[PDB]
Design a protein around this ligand. Structure first.
Ligand SMILES: C/C=C(/C)C(=O)O[C@H]1C(C)=C2[C@H]([C@@H]1OC(=O)CCCCCCC)[C@@](C)(OC(C)=O)C[C@H](OC(=O)CCC)[C@@]1(O)[C@H]2OC(=O)[C@@]1(C)O
Ligand code: ALF
Ligand SMILES: [K+]
Ligand SMILES: [Mg+2]
Length: 994
């Protein structure tokens, strides 16, 4: 049943054909259960342990590396009786890595809580219906409730379905709709139609929403919709349908892998065409299958050399250590990759209540009457500090602390706030904080009374538990509450009837203490209290008082105001009927006006400063709130989202106002406006979505169930530590300390980490470029492989891996939070840097394939010198009469490869130094700038020696240690790379773009 809020109660009953004092028949119920399904949200679930595995092996490079593993295995498997024990190390090492990465990957997504399951906690097990077969209420499974059911709800119940209210049995029905609005304040429901077809939930005051809860009262309603077709079901479906995108870094790595496979492919083709010569004229030595082995071994080397197999381990270690640092600063990061993304955030969307504000209703201003001069009325106003329910803060007069007990009017004001009150305060020993008990707007009064301490009660030595209600309790010793006249909608006030305590000297005669909306209370006052005296309420005095209250309720204050009053001569108890709320207004007449309090949900102390810092880093902050627009804007001013006197006509919108914009202009409003108010959960995700349609990296911060869809949609969702479990499980990060500052620190950490990540990514991928040149050079010439997969794997995983990690700890730039965010489309390597890496790529390949040639030739030992024969060594077998003075095997000597590996290693170590800064010479930024980098190079080098000098390492790697002369050469060949890159940095620094 749709449009329930705009139908009348009669139309809702006539729609389902049911009577409110009978309800559906059990056969109707069965029929509805078949037609509408059960009243429950489906569970999300999925992702089997096995399918986590499968997904680890769908990555393109992983496939390519896996393919090389099997090709390697097939080759290693069918080998001669030469050495068939160290043959398989190649395949297994490759397979080991892939398996290693995978198991790690699956552990990263295994532990992931379901936000939808947390949502299911707002779903009561049981509900109450009237159905036709019984007169009395039936307690049933909420999942068996159907549209058309007559349903009953009462104080403390979770609402079981979406329900049109039919009849309110108590004096008021008070509902906490925070799951839809983020606001815990009681909504006072009624049963009249709400004609606006576009009413938001906040406007639907005749509806009860599944998953909200009744703070007071009792009512009957009729179920309009169940299951997914409810407001909470829409939150559930939005979460189900969202859906985390690859991070900007992931996308660049994916694109890299795609382009890498094309490059590998084209090169393989090339090696084939380069050998189309030895095709029709291959001697037939020969040919046979020797070609398959040869060609495929080149494929395996090309694959291995092209792929930074150490990178995934390097990135994971970086992100994991980053996560630990963040946790020290109180940002708990649930998604590793999100460590990066946070850094290039360009817009932070934020919920208000409990996120930008404390969610602790606080009385911050109050006044009483100092004197009346017939027509002139002098008010005595105070302000009160403190922003939480903690009884910490002071009462100020003109910004200086006063003792409230100095003023009789304040004594009476506190008395009313203490006695006319159904709430209290509690110190929660487990959480270490004060919490409200009952309604926020009443607990505000309790807290105010504890701050005022009008009898100067000694409180410094109470435990926090006892401190919570100490001053209120003192007032309860003076006046005994006999009974309460509860709030009703007709009069918008409530009162309590009290008598002086036995033996009290401080007063005589019974009193009613009244509080409520100012207009109706003041209209009912015939007097005004001035200290201990009272004078008549005149028109001019009433007007001055109402005007000031009106100012407090609007503009920059926009406080919620209560007028406080006393009936000095109440009716006699026995002349009052307590069972008919319709009489309460008359009982609360001939009142004496005492004073007014003004309260708000205030900004967290750190927020204004943090927003400024975000602004310094080029980051916009946008408030998106379920609260009213007047409040939203006033809070925006207090925290500096708007200027105090800024005109916000097109910078602030309700969700509805926003919806009324043409689609083209909704998008632009998202770039211009910084305040959205009175929204529904789906407005927030919509705004986030529009922001993202400008390709901005968008964060969302909040604490409520109603924030969850936006928290899911944003690239980075950020939940408050003390907020709902739903918002937390929807988030990439949790602020454990509720401190908004932490977001700024997290952004900075993300920027710092990303700056280092791209150096180690630059470092590793550029080595692969040099390695591929090597493999290709040592093929297009017909030379005996200068490097083999096992050696390439050690370098890319360990030798270069350690320095890559060290670079992850380069000192951060000091101006980091003064730059605007990086563009998420920024290439890791482009332009000058690109060709620069081509030049090192060329240098690396020639230097490596060269060192080996040097050994085959100019080296003393020194087969040696061959020239034409080196590039035809596969013919030492058959055509031997030419290969004289040398063994048909000296072309598989370890020395040449060891020269080549040592050159590669030494170059990659120098290149690790070059990678400390993109454009600064080591002369301006020296190695010791990163102590752990030097440490890592010493380690990699001592590992290189390990493999050169410790059996059977050299056998499995096919290496033979070198002497001082061979090393002397390793250095001459290698060290110039530092000179090469210093010159390339030099030009880039000056001529190019400097
Ligand atoms: C790593 C080993 C090489 C062989 C390779 O395949 O990488 C290329 C390729 C995939 C790109 C290139 C490499 O292209 C070459 O330079 C070809 C050299 C070898 C060809 C024949 C030599 C015998 C990168 C490496 O080369 C530079 C450094 O000169 C730069 C950059 O890479 C990045 O920006 C890293 C992204 C994480 C990418 O052009 C990248 O592809 C694009 O999508 C980007 C944006 O990725
Ligand atoms: F706390 Al809100 F919008 F949910 F301000
Ligand atoms: K998200
Ligand atoms: Mg909130």
């Amino acid at each position: 049943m749709e449009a329930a809020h705009s139908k009348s109660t009669e139309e809702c009953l006539a729609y389902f054909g049911v009577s409110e004092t009978t309800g559906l028949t059990p056969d109707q119920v069965k029929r509805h259960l078949e037609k509408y399904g059960h009243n429950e949200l489906p569970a999300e679930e999925g992702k089997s342990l096995w399918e986590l595995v499968i997904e680890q092996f769908e990555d393109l490079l992983v496939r390519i590396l896996l393919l090389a593993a099997c090709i390697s295995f097939v080759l290693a498997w069918f080998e001669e009786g030469e050495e068939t024990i160290t043959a398989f190390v190649e395949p297994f090492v490759i397979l080991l890595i892939l398996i290693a990465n995978a198991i790690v990957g699956v552990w990263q997504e295994r532990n992931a809580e379901n936000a939808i399951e947390a949502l299911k906690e707002y779903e009561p097990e049981m509900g109450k219906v009237y159905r036709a077969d019984r007169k009395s209420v039936q307690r049933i499974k909420a999942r068996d409730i159907v549209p058309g059911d007559i349903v009953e709800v009462a104080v403390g119940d979770k609402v079981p379905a979406d329900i049109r209210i039919l009849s309110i049995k108590s004096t008021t029905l008070r509902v906490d709709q925070s799951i839809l609005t983020g606001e815990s304040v009681s909504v006072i429901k009624h049963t009249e139609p709400v004609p606006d077809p576009r009413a938001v939930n906040q406007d639907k005051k005749n509806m009860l929403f599944s998953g909200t809860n009744i703070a007071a009262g009792k009512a009957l309603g009729i179920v309009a919709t169940t299951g997914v077709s409810t407001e909470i079901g829409k939150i559930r479906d939005q979460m189900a349908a969202t859906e985390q995108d690859k991070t900007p870094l992931q996308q660049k790595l994916d694109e890299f892998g795609e382009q890498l496979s094309k490059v590998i492919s084209l090169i393989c083709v090339a090696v084939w065409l380069i050998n189309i010569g030895h095709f029709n004229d291959p001697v037939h030595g020969g040919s046979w299958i020797r070609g398959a082995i040869y060609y495929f071994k080149i494929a395996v080397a090309l694959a291995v050399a092209a792929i930074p197999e150490g990178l995934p381990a390097v990135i994971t270690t970086c992100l994991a250590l980053g996560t630990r640092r963040m946790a020290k600063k109180n940002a708990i990061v649930r998604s590793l990759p999100s460590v990066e993304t946070l850094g290039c955030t360009s817009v932070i969307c934020s919920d208000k209540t409990g996120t930008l504000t404390t969610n602790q209703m606080s009385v911050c201003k109050m006044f009483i009457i100092d004197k009346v001069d017939g027509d002139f009325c002098s008010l005595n106003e105070f302000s009160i500090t403190g922003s939480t329910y903690a009884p910490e803060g002071e009462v100020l007069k003109n910004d200086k602390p006063i003792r409230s007990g100095q003023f009789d009017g304040l004594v009476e004001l506190a008395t009313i706030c203490a006695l006319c009150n159904d709430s209290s305060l509690d110190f929660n020993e487990t959480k270490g904080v004060y919490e409200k008990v009952g309604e926020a707007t009443e607990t505000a009064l309790t807290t105010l009374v504890e701050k005022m301490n009008v009898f100067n009660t000694e409180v410094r030595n109470l435990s926090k538990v006892e401190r919570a209600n100490a001053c209120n309790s003192v007032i309860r010793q003076l006046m005994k509450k006999e009974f309460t006249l509860e709030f009703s909608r007709d009069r918008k006030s409530m009162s309590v009837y009290c008598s002086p305590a036995k033996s009290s000297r401080a007063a005589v005669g019974n009193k009613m203490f009244v509080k409520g909306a100012p207009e109706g209370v003041i209209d009912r006052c015939n007097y005004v209290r001035v200290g201990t005296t009272r004078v008549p309420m005149t028109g001019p005095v009433k007007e001055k008082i109402l005007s000031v209250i009106k100012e407090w309720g609007t503009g920059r204050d926009t406080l919620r105001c209560l007028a406080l009053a006393t009936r000095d001569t109440p009716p006699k108890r026995e002349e009052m009927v307590l069972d008919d709320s319709s009489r309460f207004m008359e009982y609360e007449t001939d009142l004496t006006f005492v004073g007014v309090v003004g309260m708000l949900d205030p900004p967290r102390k750190e927020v204004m400063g943090s927003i400024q810092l975000c602004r310094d880093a080029g980051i916009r902050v946008i408030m998106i709130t379920g609260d009213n627009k007047g409040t939203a804007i006033a809070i925006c001013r207090r925290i500096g989202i708007f200027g105090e006197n800024e005109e916000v006509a097109d910078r602030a919108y309700t969700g509805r106002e926003f919806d009324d914009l043409p689609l083209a202009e909704q998008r632009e409003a998202c770039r211009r406006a910084c305040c959205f108010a009175r929204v529904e959960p789906s407005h927030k995700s919509k705004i986030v979505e529009y922001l993202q349609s400008y390709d901005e990296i968008t964060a969302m911060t909040g604490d409520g169930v109603n924030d969850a869809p936006a928290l899911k949609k944003a690239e980075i969702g950020i939940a408050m530590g003390s907020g709902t479990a739903v918002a937390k499980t929807a988030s990439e990060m949790v602020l454990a300390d509720d401190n908004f500052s932490t977001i700024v620190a997290a952004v900075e950490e993300g920027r710092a980490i990303y700056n280092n990540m791209k150096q180690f990514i630059r470092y590793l991928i550029s080595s692969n470029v040099g390695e591929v040149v090597c493999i290709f050079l040592t093929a297009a010439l017909g030379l005996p492989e200068a490097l083999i997969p096992v050696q390439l794997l050690w370098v890319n995983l360990v030798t270069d891996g350690l320095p890559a990690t060290a670079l992850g700890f380069n000192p951060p730039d000091l101006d980091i939070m003064d730059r605007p965010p990086r563009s998420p489309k920024e290439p890791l390597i482009s332009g000058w840097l690109f060709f620069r890496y081509m030049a090192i790529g060329g240098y690396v390949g020639a230097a490596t394939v060269g060192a080996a040639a040097w050994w085959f030739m100019y080296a003393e030992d020194g087969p040696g010198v061959t020239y034409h024969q080196l590039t035809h060594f596969m013919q030492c077998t058959e055509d031997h009469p030419h290969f004289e003075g040398l063994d048909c095997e000296i072309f598989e000597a370890p020395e040449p490869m060891t020269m080549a590996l040592s050159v590669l290693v030494t170059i990659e170590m120098c290149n690790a130094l070059n990678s400390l800064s993109e454009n600064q010479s080591l002369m301006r930024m020296p190695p010791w700038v990163n102590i752990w980098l030097l440490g890592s190079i010493c380690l990699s080098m001592s590992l290189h020696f390990l493999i050169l000098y410790v059996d059977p390492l050299p056998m499995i790697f096919k290496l033979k240690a070198l002497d001082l002369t061979q090393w002397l050469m390793v250095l001459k060949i290698s060290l110039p790379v530092i000179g090469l890159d210093e010159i390339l940095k030099f030009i880039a620094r000056n001529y190019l773009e400097g």
